């Protein structure tokens, strides 16, 4: 029903233990160090094996 203006895909491969770290407000070697999400992040996270 709702559609979006500027869709950007963030495609990369990490360890399976650190997928929950991809969230607005988390830490880790992925979240805190190189791939950080904003505090006002309005988006979707799609991950698979």
């Amino acid at each position: 029903d709702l559609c979006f203006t500027n869709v950007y895909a963030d495609s990369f491969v990490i360890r399976g233990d650190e997928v929950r770290q991809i969230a607005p407000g988390q830490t880790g070697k992925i979240a805190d160090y190189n791939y950080k999400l904003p505090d006002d992040f309005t988006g979707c996270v799609i991950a698979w094996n």
Binding site: D1, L2, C3, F4, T5
Partner: protein, 162 residues
Amino acid sequence: KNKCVNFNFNGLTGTGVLTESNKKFLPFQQFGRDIADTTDAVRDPQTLEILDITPCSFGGVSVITPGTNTSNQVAVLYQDVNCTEVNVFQTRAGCLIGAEHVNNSYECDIPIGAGICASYQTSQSIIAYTMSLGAENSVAYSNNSIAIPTNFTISVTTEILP
């Protein structure tokens, strides 16, 4: 256009009226907003035209009726509209459907507004009359006339205050 519909522009859903406008959007601008921050205008993404969003449910509704013990016949006063939406009569407050115009100006029985008052009188229905100001008296005035009572009365006026 010109009908209250359920619009959907770029995912934004709502109830509004689409009309043409003289507003010209900038090429990076899509949504027009108001003081109340709601979307007042959108832009058609297929063809280049500008459409406003007018909110629906317009016109106040007054309920002019006596008690349910007396009768169930009612008169509905529609403010801020003419008699188009809907014994049809137009008053100074709005369209009044259900009350017959009576030229006899009586005392105000039901306070309505805009100098109009109603009552349930005589086949009995709600009548619509102009609110009378009272019994008009013409004072016979001159430079050599005076009215002085030869007799009076003692009336006990009851004023009741909390």
